[PDB]
Enzyme design. Structure first.
Site, PDB file in Angstrom:
ATOM      1  CD  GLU A 195      60.613 127.098 -38.191  1.00  0.00           C
ATOM      2  OE1 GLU A 195      60.221 128.049 -38.909  1.00  0.00           O
ATOM      3  OE2 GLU A 195      61.795 126.689 -38.222  1.00  0.00           O
ATOM      4  NE  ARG A 198      61.362 131.805 -37.320  1.00  0.00           N
ATOM      5  CZ  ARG A 198      62.078 130.918 -36.632  1.00  0.00           C
ATOM      6  NH1 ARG A 198      61.882 129.611 -36.792  1.00  0.00           N
ATOM      7  NH2 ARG A 198      62.983 131.335 -35.761  1.00  0.00           N
TER       8      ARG A 198
HETATM    9  N1  LIG Z   1      66.638 127.510 -30.967  1.00  0.00           N
HETATM   10  C1  LIG Z   1      66.128 127.730 -32.177  1.00  0.00           C
HETATM   11  N2  LIG Z   1      66.689 127.160 -33.264  1.00  0.00           N
HETATM   12  C2  LIG Z   1      66.214 127.355 -34.507  1.00  0.00           C
HETATM   13  N3  LIG Z   1      66.844 126.775 -35.549  1.00  0.00           N
HETATM   14  C3  LIG Z   1      66.415 126.920 -36.821  1.00  0.00           C
HETATM   15  C4  LIG Z   1      67.155 126.317 -37.851  1.00  0.00           C
HETATM   16  O1  LIG Z   1      68.065 125.534 -37.578  1.00  0.00           O
HETATM   17  N4  LIG Z   1      66.983 126.798 -39.102  1.00  0.00           N
HETATM   18  C5  LIG Z   1      67.824 126.294 -40.209  1.00  0.00           C
HETATM   19  C6  LIG Z   1      67.030 126.085 -41.506  1.00  0.00           C
HETATM   20  C7  LIG Z   1      67.818 125.150 -42.446  1.00  0.00           C
HETATM   21  C8  LIG Z   1      68.141 123.838 -42.057  1.00  0.00           C
HETATM   22  C9  LIG Z   1      68.859 123.003 -42.921  1.00  0.00           C
HETATM   23  C10 LIG Z   1      69.252 123.482 -44.176  1.00  0.00           C
HETATM   24  O2  LIG Z   1      69.952 122.672 -45.020  1.00  0.00           O
HETATM   25  C11 LIG Z   1      68.933 124.788 -44.568  1.00  0.00           C
HETATM   26  C12 LIG Z   1      68.218 125.621 -43.700  1.00  0.00           C
HETATM   27  C13 LIG Z   1      69.040 127.216 -40.443  1.00  0.00           C
HETATM   28  O3  LIG Z   1      68.836 128.445 -40.543  1.00  0.00           O
HETATM   29  O4  LIG Z   1      70.160 126.661 -40.500  1.00  0.00           O
HETATM   30  C14 LIG Z   1      65.283 127.710 -37.058  1.00  0.00           C
HETATM   31  N5  LIG Z   1      64.627 128.319 -35.976  1.00  0.00           N
HETATM   32  C15 LIG Z   1      65.080 128.153 -34.715  1.00  0.00           C
HETATM   33  C16 LIG Z   1      64.468 128.757 -33.603  1.00  0.00           C
HETATM   34  O5  LIG Z   1      63.465 129.460 -33.706  1.00  0.00           O
HETATM   35  N6  LIG Z   1      64.990 128.530 -32.323  1.00  0.00           N
HETATM   36  N1  LIG Z   2      69.411 135.293 -30.886  1.00  0.00           N
HETATM   37  C1  LIG Z   2      69.977 134.318 -31.580  1.00  0.00           C
HETATM   38  N2  LIG Z   2      69.754 134.215 -32.902  1.00  0.00           N
HETATM   39  C2  LIG Z   2      70.319 133.236 -33.637  1.00  0.00           C
HETATM   40  N3  LIG Z   2      70.062 133.179 -34.958  1.00  0.00           N
HETATM   41  C3  LIG Z   2      70.591 132.227 -35.754  1.00  0.00           C
HETATM   42  C4  LIG Z   2      70.297 132.227 -37.124  1.00  0.00           C
HETATM   43  O1  LIG Z   2      70.231 131.174 -37.765  1.00  0.00           O
HETATM   44  N4  LIG Z   2      70.142 133.459 -37.659  1.00  0.00           N
HETATM   45  C5  LIG Z   2      69.830 133.714 -39.082  1.00  0.00           C
HETATM   46  C6  LIG Z   2      68.344 134.110 -39.210  1.00  0.00           C
HETATM   47  C7  LIG Z   2      67.521 132.834 -39.382  1.00  0.00           C
HETATM   48  C8  LIG Z   2      66.808 132.290 -38.302  1.00  0.00           C
HETATM   49  C9  LIG Z   2      66.065 131.114 -38.482  1.00  0.00           C
HETATM   50  C10 LIG Z   2      66.051 130.498 -39.741  1.00  0.00           C
HETATM   51  O2  LIG Z   2      65.347 129.358 -39.956  1.00  0.00           O
HETATM   52  C11 LIG Z   2      66.768 131.046 -40.803  1.00  0.00           C
HETATM   53  C12 LIG Z   2      67.502 132.214 -40.633  1.00  0.00           C
HETATM   54  C13 LIG Z   2      70.760 134.781 -39.702  1.00  0.00           C
HETATM   55  O3  LIG Z   2      71.589 135.339 -38.948  1.00  0.00           O
HETATM   56  O4  LIG Z   2      70.646 134.993 -40.932  1.00  0.00           O
HETATM   57  C14 LIG Z   2      71.440 131.265 -35.191  1.00  0.00           C
HETATM   58  N5  LIG Z   2      71.714 131.316 -33.807  1.00  0.00           N
HETATM   59  C15 LIG Z   2      71.162 132.283 -33.044  1.00  0.00           C
HETATM   60  C16 LIG Z   2      71.417 132.369 -31.669  1.00  0.00           C
HETATM   61  O5  LIG Z   2      72.150 131.572 -31.088  1.00  0.00           O
HETATM   62  N6  LIG Z   2      70.815 133.396 -30.929  1.00  0.00           N
END
Ligand SMILES: Nc1nc2nc(C(=O)N[C@@H](Cc3ccc(O)cc3)C(=O)O)cnc2c(=O)[nH]1
Ligand SMILES: Nc1nc2nc(C(=O)N[C@@H](Cc3ccc(O)cc3)C(=O)O)cnc2c(=O)[nH]1
EC number: 3.2.2.22
Length: 263
Positions: free
Chosen positions: A173, A176
Site C-alpha cells: 500500500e 501504491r
Molecule cells: N496479499 C495481498 N492482499 C491484498 N489485498 C488487498 C485487498 O483486499 N484489497 C481490497 C480493497 C477493498 C476492500 C473492501 C472493499 O469493500 C472494497 C475494496 C479488494 O480489492 O478487495 C489489497 N492488496 C493486497 C496485497 O497487496 N497483497
Molecule cells: N497475483 C495475484 N493477484 C491477485 N490479485 C487480486 C486482486 O484483487 N486483483 C485486482 C487488482 C487489485 C489489487 C489490489 C487492490 O486493492 C485492488 C485491485 C483485479 O484483478 O482487479 C486478488 N488475488 C490475487 C492473487 O491471489 N494473486
C-alpha cells in the site's frame, strides 16, 4: 533471477524506509507507462514469467529474515519464504497458480494456503479489521518474527493473518500511495504505532477504482466522482486526476491509453 529489495526494521528511519519504498516502486514499474504523471504497473497480458515477480527480503532486530514475493502487475503479496518453508495464498485463477510455481523453487517445503490473501479473508482470520490493527516499525518487527516462526508452530493463525495485514500495508500500500508511505514515515519518525485512519482505509479500498477512473478520464476529468474520506472521517470528493498526483504513486493497468488528440 527475480530482483530482491532488502529492508530491515532494525534501526529503521524515515530515510531508510523512504529508500526502501522508492526501490520497490522502481522494481515494480518499468517507466513505459506514465499517465497524468502517474506510473502504471505492467499489463498482465503477455508479460513474460521471468518479469512477473519481485522479492522483498525483510529483516528485523531479532536477526530473523523472511522474503515476500510481490506480483509486479498489482504489487500483491502472493506468498513468503522463511528458511526451509514457503507459503502461498490460494490463487485467484489458473495462471496465477502457474505463476507461483516459479517462486522459491529451491525451498524444501512448499505450501499453498487454503485461503486467499485479500483483506476480507485476512481480517476474518485475524479476528480484527484493518482499522483496529496497529501499524508502524514495532508492528512490522513483530510481524517478521511471526511469519518466521509459523512453520514450527509458534504463530497462531490469527497472529499470522494480522502479520500479513501489517506487511501488505507497510510495503504494497505504501508503494501504491505516496500518502500511505507518508503515514508510515510519520509512525517510524516518532516510533509510535497506530491503526490506519479512514483516509488510509478508503485509499486502500479505492485503488482499483481510482486507477480505472484516471485511465478512463477525459483529459484527466472523471465522468463519475469518487468519494474518499479524510483523516477525521469526513467525505472528500475526487473529480480529477490533478488532486491525486501527490497521493497515488502507482496504478494497476486497467485499459490501453487513448490516442492523444492533436489540436
Ligand atoms: N496479499 C495481498 N492482499 C491484498 N489485498 C488487498 C485487498 O483486499 N484489497 C481490497 C480493497 C477493498 C476492500 C473492501 C472493499 O469493500 C472494497 C475494496 C479488494 O480489492 O478487495 C489489497 N492488496 C493486497 C496485497 O497487496 N497483497
Ligand atoms: N497475483 C495475484 N493477484 C491477485 N490479485 C487480486 C486482486 O484483487 N486483483 C485486482 C487488482 C487489485 C489489487 C489490489 C487492490 O486493492 C485492488 C485491485 C483485479 O484483478 O482487479 C486478488 N488475488 C490475487 C492473487 O491471489 N494473486
Amino acid at each position: 533471477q527475480y530482483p530482491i529489495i532488502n529492508f530491515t526494521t532494525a534501526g529503521a528511519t524515515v530515510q531508510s524506509y523512504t529508500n526502501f519504498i522508492r526501490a520497490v516502486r522502481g522494481r515494480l514499474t518499468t517507466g513505459a507507462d506514465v499517465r497524468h504523471e502517474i506510473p502504471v504497473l505492467p499489463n498482465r497480458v503477455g508479460l513474460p514469467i521471468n518479469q512477473r515477480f519481485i522479492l522483498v527480503e525483510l529483516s528485523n532486530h531479532a536477526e530473523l529474515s523472511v522474503t515476500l514475493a510481490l506480483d509486479v502487475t498489482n504489487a500483491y503479496v502472493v506468498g513468503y519464504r522463511a528458511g526451509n518453508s514457503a507459503y502461498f495464498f490460494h490463487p485467484d485463477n489458473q495462471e496465477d497458480a502457474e505463476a507461483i510455481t516459479h517462486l522459491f523453487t529451491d525451498v524444501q517445503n512448499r505450501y499453498t494456503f487454503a485461503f486467499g490473501g485479500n483483506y476480507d479473508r485476512l481480517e476474518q482470520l485475524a479476528g480484527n479489521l484493518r482499522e483496529n490493527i496497529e501499524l508502524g516499525n514495532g508492528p512490522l518487527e513483530e510481524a517478521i518474527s511471526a511469519l518466521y516462526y509459523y512453520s514450527t508452530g509458534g504463530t497462531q493463525l490469527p497472529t499470522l493473518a494480522r502479520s500479513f495485514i501489517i506487511c501488505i500495508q507497510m510495503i504494497s500500500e505504501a508503494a501504491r500511495f505516496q500518502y500511505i508511505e507518508g503515514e508510515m514515515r510519520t509512525r517510524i519518525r516518532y516510533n509510535r504505532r497506530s491503526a490506519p485512519d479512514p483516509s488510509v482505509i478508503t485509499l486502500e479500498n479505492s485503488w482499483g477504482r481510482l486507477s480505472t477512473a484516471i485511465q478512463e478520464s477525459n483529459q484527466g476529468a472523471f465522468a463519475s466522482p469518487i468519494q474518499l474520506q479524510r483523516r477525521n472521517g469526513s467525505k472528500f470528493s475526487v473529480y480529477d486526476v490533478s488532486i491525486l498526483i501527490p497521493i497515488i504513486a502507482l496504478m494497476v493497468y486497467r485499459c490501453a491509453p487513448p490516442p492523444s488528440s492533436q489540436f
